[PDB]
Write a protein that binds this ligand. Sequence first.
Ligand SMILES: Nc1ncnc2c1ncn2[C@@H]1O[C@H](COP(=O)(O)OP(=O)(O)OP(=O)(O)O)[C@@H](O)[C@H]1O
Ligand SMILES: Nc1ncnc2c1ncn2[C@@H]1O[C@H](COP(=O)(O)OP(=O)(O)O)[C@@H](O)[C@H]1O
Ligand SMILES: [Mg+2]
Lengths: 117, 353, 52, 52, 57, 384, 128, 64
Amino acid sequence: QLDPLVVGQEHYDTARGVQSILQRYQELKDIIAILGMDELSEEDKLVVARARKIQRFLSQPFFVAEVFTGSPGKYVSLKDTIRGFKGIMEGEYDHLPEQAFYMVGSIEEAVEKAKKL
Amino acid sequence: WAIHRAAPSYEELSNSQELLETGIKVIDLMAPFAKGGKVGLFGGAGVGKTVNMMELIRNIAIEHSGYSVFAGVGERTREGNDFYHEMTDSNVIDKVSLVYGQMNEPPGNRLRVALTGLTMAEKFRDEGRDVLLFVDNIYRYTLAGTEVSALLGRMPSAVGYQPTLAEEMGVLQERITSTKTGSITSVQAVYVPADDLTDPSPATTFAHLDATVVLSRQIASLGIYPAVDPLDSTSRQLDPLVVGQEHYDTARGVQSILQRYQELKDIIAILGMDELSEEDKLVVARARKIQRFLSQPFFVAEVFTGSPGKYVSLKDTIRGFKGIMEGEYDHLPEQAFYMVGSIEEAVEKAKKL
Amino acid sequence: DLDLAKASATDQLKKAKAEAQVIIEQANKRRSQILDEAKAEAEQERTKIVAQ
Amino acid sequence: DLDLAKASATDQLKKAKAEAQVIIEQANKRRSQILDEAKAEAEQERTKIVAQ
Amino acid sequence: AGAKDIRSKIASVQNTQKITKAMEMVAASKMRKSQDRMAASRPYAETMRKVIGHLAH
Amino acid sequence: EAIAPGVIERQSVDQPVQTGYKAVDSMIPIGRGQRELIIGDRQTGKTALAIDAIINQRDSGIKCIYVAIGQKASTISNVVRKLEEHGALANTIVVVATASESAALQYLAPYAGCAMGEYFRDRGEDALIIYDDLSKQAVAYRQISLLLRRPPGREAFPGDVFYLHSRLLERAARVNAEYVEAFTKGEVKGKTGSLTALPIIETQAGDVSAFVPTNVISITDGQIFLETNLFNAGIRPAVNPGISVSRVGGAAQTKIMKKLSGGIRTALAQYRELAAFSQFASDLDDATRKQLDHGQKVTELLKQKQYAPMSVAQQSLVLFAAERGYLADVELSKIGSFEAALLAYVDRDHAPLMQEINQTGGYNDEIEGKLKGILDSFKATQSW
Amino acid sequence: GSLTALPIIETQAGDVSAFVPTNVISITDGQIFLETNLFNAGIRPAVNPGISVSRVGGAAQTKIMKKLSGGIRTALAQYRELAAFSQFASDLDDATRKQLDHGQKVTELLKQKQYAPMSVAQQSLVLF
Amino acid sequence: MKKLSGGIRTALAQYRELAAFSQFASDLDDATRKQLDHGQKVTELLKQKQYAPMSVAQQSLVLF
Ligand SMILES: Nc1ncnc2c1ncn2[C@@H]1O[C@H](COP(=O)(O)OP(=O)(O)OP(=O)(O)O)[C@@H](O)[C@H]1O
Ligand SMILES: Nc1ncnc2c1ncn2[C@@H]1O[C@H](COP(=O)(O)OP(=O)(O)O)[C@@H](O)[C@H]1O
Ligand SMILES: [Mg+2]
């Protein structure tokens, strides 16, 4: 069902951009392993940081997992998630620590969590 | 006696846990032997395995009242003949019973020779003695059983081995234990296929080994004999609850000292000596002394070193190493420890140097 | 200034000389407590050994 | 002069810290050395009663 | 995967380890030389600053 | 050979099973009726962690069963001598099939042990059963299966190597009072029985993704994963957070422990991974610095000696000291001493409060205040 | 009486850890490992020091050869890794330059035409 | 198309030969930087959407 016709051009494009970024991050994982991260070009150090932010933003708390983590679950509408990923990719949140994105429902909650670190 | 027998029942086993004083400093400190346990010897070639075996035979015959049995499962005939001679010309041949089934034998012989050796060791045990049983290669005792199992047409199993691998290994390794009347200790040479410690044969063997002493070409190259590697040799007897706190923490001390020196020496190799810190120079100066003190002269090695062989009790090794590590004896040179024996002889060697 | 340095001298030695002993006293106090635990436990495990 | 007094004060406190560590160290070493003797004697007592 | 691909990758990683182990030694020798050339540079500035100080202030 | 109670006869696991160890009692709780795999490599402390749970039931009314499959006879004799040394043997059944015995005794032993435990389960009592190696049971079954010429599957294990462990571990269950009534012909009213299982698995080279390890991870309700890198580093019990979970979660913890513990385990997992990158360098370097110091002191606090169980009261107040600050000043060298003193002091003075927290889940703002008071008192007036 | 045997084994891609090669290496008293990289690079015979060894060794060597051939093997084993370091390092220390050029002289010395065997006199003289 | 594709083959060949350096692109000489940046562009040119077929004239035009 992931076709421009079925899901709209905006959703499709955000999904494909996320895939591209994460794959580009996979391709660097071995050079990062051997030579350390300081050898990566400045353009490819931005790719890595956005890739990691995206990795964390895909996490979410579930109502059926409160028994494990204690945190309350979240329900995220589609309209509300393609916007957050468009933002993270376009860079409008590129000044925020990674852990601002771990286990939050919507991008608002992440910009809010960043205030507490 | 018949060679097929049942392991000692549950209530024959010794209700204690003693230790075997081999008389070698490196082993007694870094890899103590349990009386009635299994010891793997993972050294290669050109490192002295045969002379280590002869020293263990000599010490366990003299400083205890035990005999020994050597089972030659599946190895070259040349080594068997030159072992027979190296033993006949050191007077230890009267203290060991040899049984040989070598590479030139049908599979059945290589399979049952280990049981022959073991069932002689059991007769010596029933007399109340403490016995020592050498196996020339347990891996070939596994492979002969694999050959036989294929001959019988049984279905293959894990990675080419017989389906009964663990039971064939167990019914052997479960007969050498310390009984209320006596005990059989065993020193077994182990060969790891393809350099893989996960292959079913090493994985099945290591379930039974208590200690493990690995010989190193390097430690010999530096000239230290025996050539045991103190960082890779291990024993599951090294626990305060069994060996005591002072022995445990002395061994852990020397281990940490040597494993730091192992990298301070690389820092020296790349950046030169005086790049170090002064604390580290002391570490190096003590590590070299400890490393020298792990040498020992054997009664069997007199024909090479000329020095008389020494038998070092455990207490003396613990004292020597606590002293060398507690900052005592920093005032005498590292060559005063080399090939000496006790520390009370290292002081005397430094006196005359 | 000669007046002031003398006063500071006397006061600083006042602090240091006594505080050495107050810390040494804390040391001795904890020594006593730790030895109480040590002797009590070294006695108490005799029970386990005799029941064994 | 004032500063010499200051230095003597800090030196006294340094010595006090060193002695606190040394005394508590000896007290813990005593804990262990007492408990081990108690352990070995109680255990030989067990062995005697069992042999009886 | 498969034994052959993994063995090829192991060979290539050992080769990489060789290359870096060599670059380290080269860099250490060049560091010694480049700080000798650093020690050699002081006297000129050290005396020129004294002259400038005397003349200036 | 029997079939476990059906879906309608179960009941959700509620009560706690206390081991002696802060690590598992805090991060990985075990409830009565749970099945909790202890998995790791050889010589990482599995058998130790298991018989330390057996010894701790010495007084909590839970009968215990320990089955040793394929073990050396010397090890079994030693473990029996320890079970006797701490008085637990009078409360344990030992079912033994040593490495020398037939492959048909090794393969059938854990079923005998489970049949002996179901006796208590079905009468409304509680039991705990330990399968010493369900990796050696699998090997003995593989032998018996290959000797019958049965086509093998992956790693030469038979097709039904999953069913072998499934029909075994599915018996460790908790049953509702109606099952206990109907079974016992009405002799026992209102009680609920349970059988808790701790199977032990051995993994080669820490490979948590072989066949049999994964089958048993897919059969049990959690796993305690003992890592060898930690064990060699002196961290013992070497519980590796981030791979070990308890799928019954906090429902099996006492109220006080559930509160103080919280997300402590994912906190240590975060700390342990952060250490991977901070090994070289880090920014945000005061919050990550306090994060690191806290996590480090916590790991230095979670390690514990063998044969030293500590009641829920002691674990609870030590976790209190761990979480409400109270430990920043004391050094990594003193954590040990802090704990020893703390526990001796509280044994000396506040024996009643311990007697209360041990008798109940025991959490309230009243008890929080009592604990804070004890904490500042020990912290200031006691010098450790 | 005596009977010495020189069995020959073929390996794929120089992999020693194959089945038959690792059996026969475990049966015999040594191995002469013939390296393809040395052969195609004109070093013939392509004997590889370091990875080849004789486990009876000097015990069977004639006295003059035993005296004149003590250092050769380890010298070449070290020279062949020093030459592998040398590619990335120009401006080599003179101390190592001496060792490299000496190892190179000797390596050039040991190659030999296909059918020209040498008596012990000639071999000992050249090694002297 | 036979005329035009000959240059695409060689552009992608040289790009595949140089690709190893794409991770160290900053170090390269500009004489090869041009080959690498032409390879990346001819690679980005061969991307195409689904159900969007090109007549031979359009393919030839774009490859030209
Ligand atoms: N918490 C601990 N602190 C210190 N030492 C420990 C601890 N736990 C275990 N050990 C040590 O580890 C050693 C081996 O542990 P244990 O035998 O329980 O592991 P295992 O996995 O059962 O070994 P195997 O797999 O061979 O049976 C024990 O002798 C014990 O001394
Ligand atoms: N304790 C020792 N003292 C002196 N020399 C020793 C000692 N141990 C081993 N060696 C030397 O190490 C060499 C290895 O010989 P050998 O034991 O035959 O090899 P392997 O042990 O591989 O069979 C011997 O030639 C011997 O001279
Ligand atoms: Mg175990």
